[PDB]
Design a protein around this motif. Structure first.
Motif, mmCIF file in Angstrom:
data_model
loop_
_atom_site.group_PDB
_atom_site.id
_atom_site.type_symbol
_atom_site.label_atom_id
_atom_site.label_comp_id
_atom_site.label_asym_id
_atom_site.label_seq_id
_atom_site.Cartn_x
_atom_site.Cartn_y
_atom_site.Cartn_z
ATOM 1 N N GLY A 75 0.881 -1.091 0.221
ATOM 2 C CA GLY A 75 -0.128 0.048 -0.091
ATOM 3 C C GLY A 75 0.921 1.238 0.035
ATOM 4 N N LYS A 76 0.383 2.173 -0.560
ATOM 5 C CA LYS A 76 1.321 3.549 -0.726
ATOM 6 C C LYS A 76 0.560 4.784 -0.350
ATOM 7 N N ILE A 77 1.047 5.601 0.364
ATOM 8 C CA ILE A 77 0.399 7.062 0.608
ATOM 9 C C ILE A 77 1.549 8.164 0.779
ATOM 10 N N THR A 78 1.412 9.403 0.296
ATOM 11 C CA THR A 78 2.198 10.187 0.345
ATOM 12 C C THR A 78 1.572 11.482 0.907
ATOM 13 N N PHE A 79 2.299 12.142 2.056
ATOM 14 C CA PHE A 79 1.708 13.268 2.678
ATOM 15 C C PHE A 79 2.532 14.593 2.251
ATOM 16 N N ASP A 83 -2.061 6.196 -3.214
ATOM 17 C CA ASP A 83 -1.568 5.437 -4.449
ATOM 18 C C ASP A 83 -2.424 4.167 -4.328
ATOM 19 N N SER A 84 -2.332 3.448 -3.259
ATOM 20 C CA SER A 84 -2.837 2.118 -2.948
ATOM 21 C C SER A 84 -3.297 2.030 -1.490
ATOM 22 N N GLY A 85 -4.330 1.170 -1.106
ATOM 23 C CA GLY A 85 -4.518 0.939 0.322
ATOM 24 C C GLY A 85 -5.648 1.784 0.933
ATOM 25 N N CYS A 86 -5.945 1.104 2.091
ATOM 26 C CA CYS A 86 -6.903 1.846 3.020
ATOM 27 C C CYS A 86 -6.216 2.473 4.255
#
Length: 173
Positions: A1-5, A38-41
């Protein structure tokens, strides 16, 4: 999973790409005004070690903190929520599971209107992750409910006994 803040709204400024749980994100940015899932919860938390306000994020672009219903630009910890194949919760009328009860496997945009009673004080999450909201229609403060038991509102991080809606964390797409 990927996230960018990102520190600034509209995906601008200093940022941090993340793939795992983080009990403390302060070392990589001091404020968050936009995010790209990008992906994930993900469950964003206002304070370290998964406390303070909680915000549920599904894949998409969030230009302003208000797009994830944030109370401010504070995001200091995060959880990658696991995929669940089924969802089941027991809603009790009284705390400690006492009183009347209903069992649900679907989302409820309005709890107190749908059942034969309207006081909800304890939960028993049997399967899946859910987001409990303070107001009907998935509005207000949010509280991540993971598998397990919650006997009083103090167990799901709520500073108060207000609940109006519920939803299964599943996926945006």
């Amino acid at each position: 999973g990927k996230i960018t803040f990102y520190e600034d709204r509209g995906f601008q400024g200093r940022h941090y790409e993340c793939s795992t749980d983080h009990s403390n994100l302060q070392p990589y940015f001091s404020r968050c005004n936009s995010v790209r899932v990008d992906s994930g919860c993900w469950m964003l938390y206002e304070q370290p070690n998964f406390t303070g306000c909680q915000y549920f994020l599904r894949r998409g672009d969030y230009p302003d903190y208000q797009q994830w219903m944030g109370f401010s630009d504070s995001v200091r910890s995060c959880r990658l929520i696991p995929h669940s194949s089924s969802h089941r919760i027991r809603i009790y009328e009284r705390e400690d599971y006492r009183g009347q009860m209903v069992e649900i496997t679907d989302d409820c945009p309005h709890l107190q209107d749908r059942f034969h009673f309207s006081d909800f004080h304890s939960f028993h999450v049997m399967e899946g992750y859910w987001v409990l909201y303070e107001m009907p229609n998935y509005r207000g403060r949010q509280y991540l409910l993971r598998p397990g038991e919650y006997r009083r509102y103090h167990d799901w991080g709520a500073m108060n006994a207000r609940v109006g809606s519920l939803r299964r964390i599943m996926d945006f797409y």
